[PDB]
Design a protein around this ligand. Structure first.
Ligand code: SF4
Ligand code: SF4
Ligand code: SF4
Lengths: 74, 74, 75
């Protein structure tokens, strides 16, 4: 799978959104639309549009999504 | 994604870690069975994700369908 | 207390982890600032301690003064 919901408590704590274009720039001014789970060093889905994230147990995140822990790759 | 244990890593080689439990070395480890995997191990911290931490291998993650000779039923 | 993360650990290198945020690779991570550290990260579990756990680094502890690319501003 099931997909993380934006109302889930853990999602709220990190500002997770299923669409990076809807991220809350008032809390996270350094967010860009170039940041998404697809380009995050923690995403486990490779080129797939959905996949696992270590911060979100028993759920999958969408590649076009984002959270405040978005981690630029090395 | 977080880096995975390499089967050629020294601790991996010694313990017989394999990324898929179906490829475990039964000659060295006759107590292995294909129902044993990181996913059913007491030490695996990945929950339902395809990869997750194992404290023994701290620094690199293990694959949920993998196995090593330190496997212990949860 | 557990062993501290080493900057050469594979998971640390993947996240650009440094034990001191003032040594972060600002060329690779241009949005880093020294206001970002584990002590100000939503993921840090050590509270006011100088070292403590982080969910991204199993079996170890991170330095509170440290930083990695997953630094998460608190909600
Ligand atoms: S940590 Fe990375 S993969 Fe996980 S939801 Fe946040 S941006 Fe997506
Ligand atoms: S101790 Fe358990 S979780 Fe760790 S690699 Fe071995 S079988 Fe997998
Ligand atoms: S996720 Fe946060 S607490 Fe963990 S190493 Fe990175 S900056 Fe430090």
């Amino acid at each position: 799978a099931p997909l993380v919901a934006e109302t889930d408590a853990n999602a709220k704590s990190l500002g997770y959104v299923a669409d990076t274009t809807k991220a809350d720039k008032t809390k996270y001014p350094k967010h860009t639309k170039d940041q998404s789970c697809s380009t995050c060093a923690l995403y486990q889905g490779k080129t797939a549009p959905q996949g696992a994230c270590p911060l979100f147990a028993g759920k999958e995140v969408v590649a076009k999504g984002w959270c405040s822990a978005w981690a630029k790759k090395a």
